[PDB]
Every structure is written in C-alpha cells, then in structure tokens.
C-alpha cells in the first residue's frame, strides 16, 4: 500500500489532484532558477508529478507530498525514488526533496528526510540510500551532509539522462547505510 509517514510537524502522504496546482506554483516561482536553468510550466510540473505517482503506484513508496497540519495542505515533497538509470551506484534507492521557499529555514526538509530514512532502514530494510545534485546546489548537498550522508569526490559522475554539453551534467554522490543511520 502507499505508505503514509508522520514527523512531529509534517504528514508525508500520497499526492492528491489539488497538489498539482500548489506544485505548479512552486515550480513557476523565479526562486527555482537558483536550482534549475528555467522555471517550469504546468505541463512540465505535471510531467514530474506523473513520474512520482507512477513510482508510488508501481512500488508503494515514493517522494511523499509534504502536508503541514495547522498551516498548509502541501509545501513540496521529500522521499525515496528507485535509481534504475545506468550509473556505477545503480541499482539503488535515492532520497530527494523540493520545498516551497516560504517553508525554508525551519528544518522541515531535514524533518521530512529523517522520517523518510527512518522508513527506508526500519521498514524497507534497505542496505543504503543515496542522494545526488550538482556542485553549486549548496542548499541540497548541505542537507545531505547534515543528515549524516557522506560524499566521496572520487564518485562524481556525469548524469546519463542529460546530454553531454548540459551544464548540470556533473553530479556529486552522497551515501548513508543502515549502520551509520543508527549512530544518530
Ligand atoms: C534543499 C532544501 C530542501 C533545503 O531546505 P532548508 O529549509 O534550507 O533545509 P532544512 O530543512 O535542513 O533546514 C535548515 C535551515 O533551517 C534552520 N533551522 C531552524 N530550525 C531548525 C531545526 N530545528 N532543525 C534544522 N534546521 C533548523 C537552519 O538553521 C537552516 O538555516 P540555514 O539554511 O540558513 O542554514 C530547499 O532549499 C529546496 O527545496 N530547494 C530546492 C527548491 C526547488 O528545487 N524547487 C523547484 C520546484 S519545481
């Protein structure tokens, strides 16, 4: 079944149709040009939600919609995605996050990620979870290292789903294993 998880503040849940509106708004915001070359139109936003909902439908877990009881129905997503692409560290499971700027600076992505990794190791019994981003995305790989995920620069890779001359091609790899997760 589609796993519903609970943080102290956050509800990690399956996506609803109403979430597409809120996600599209996030992805149209000029502040996303810090992370992406250009803002997303509704068709692009909807294309990613389709991938998320496909993953949930096929696997029973995925990047959970973030509900904040007392505040907002949807502030972004955080959760697990199967790595199936042809890279050195695949097959494995990655953790990813996209938060509305209004909810930055509150440890909410931190809380969401801890809840997802608790699920990853205690429930799914995964040997490891990975994360990857571009070198300039300090906010994203900052959260990875604050979670206790660790990077080997030797494991830097070209993203095989991006063309050769794509500026974001070069990615850095973070890992956390069941063992290191228990140490917190
Ligand atoms: C990567 C991302 C999730 C990080 O979010 P964040 O809120 O900065 O990260 P955290 O949840 O770990 O919170 C850490 C911050 O909260 C603060 N904080 C306050 N209380 C805290 C607490 N109890 N625990 C942790 N941090 C806390 C920290 O001091 C830190 O502030 P800082 O960034 O100035 O150092 C966010 O920047 C993001 O989603 N970016 C991508 C957006 C995007 O791609 N959108 C496109 C949509 S299509």
UniProtKB/Swiss-Prot annotation:
Binding site for CoA: 97-99, 105, 137, 142-144
Domain N-acetyltransferase: from-to ranges: 10-179
Pfam families, A to Z: Acetyltransf_3
Keywords: Acyltransferase, Transferase
Database matches in InterPro entries: Acyl_CoA_acyltransferase (IPR016181), GNAT_dom (IPR000182), N-acetyltransferase (IPR051531)
Molecular function, one GO term: acyltransferase activity, transferring groups other than amino-acyl groups
EC number: 2.3.1.-
Gene3D superfamilies found in the cross-reference section: 3.40.630.30
Function text: Catalyzes the transfer of an acetyl group from acetyl coenzyme A (AcCoA) to an acceptor substrate and releases both CoA and the acetylated product. It prefers the peptide Asp-Phe methyl ester (or aspartame) and the peptide antibiotics polymyxin B and colistin. Other substrates like dopamine, serotonin, puromycin, chloramphenicol, D-glucosamine, glycine and N-alpha-acetyl-L-glutamine are used and displayed lower activity.
Protein's UniProt name: Acetyltransferase PA3944
């Amino acid at each position: 079944a589609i796993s519903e998880l609970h943080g102290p503040r956050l509800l990690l849940r399956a996506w609803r149709d109403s979430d597409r509106e809120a996600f599209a708004e996030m992805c149209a915001d000029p502040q996303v040009m810090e992370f992406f070359p250009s803002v997303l139109d509704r068709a692009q936003s909807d294309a990613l939600v389709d991938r998320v909902q496909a993953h949930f439908a096929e696997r029973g877990y995925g990047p959970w919609a973030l509900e904040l009881p007392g505040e907002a129905a949807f502030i972004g997503f955080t959760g697990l995605f199967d790595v199936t692409m042809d890279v050195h560290f695949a097959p494995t499971v990655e953790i990813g996050w996209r938060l509305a700027p209004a909810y930055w600076g509150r440890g909410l992505a931190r809380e969401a990620a801890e809840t997802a990794l608790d699920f990853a190791f205690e429930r799914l019994r995964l040997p490891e979870v990975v994360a990857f981003t571009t070198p300039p995305n300090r906010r994203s790989w900052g959260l990875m290292e604050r979670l206790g995920m660790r990077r080997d620069p030797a494991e830097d890779f070209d993203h095989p789903l991006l063309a050769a001359d794509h500026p974001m091609r070069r990615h850095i790899l973070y890992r956390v294993d069941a063992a290191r997760w228990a140490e917190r």
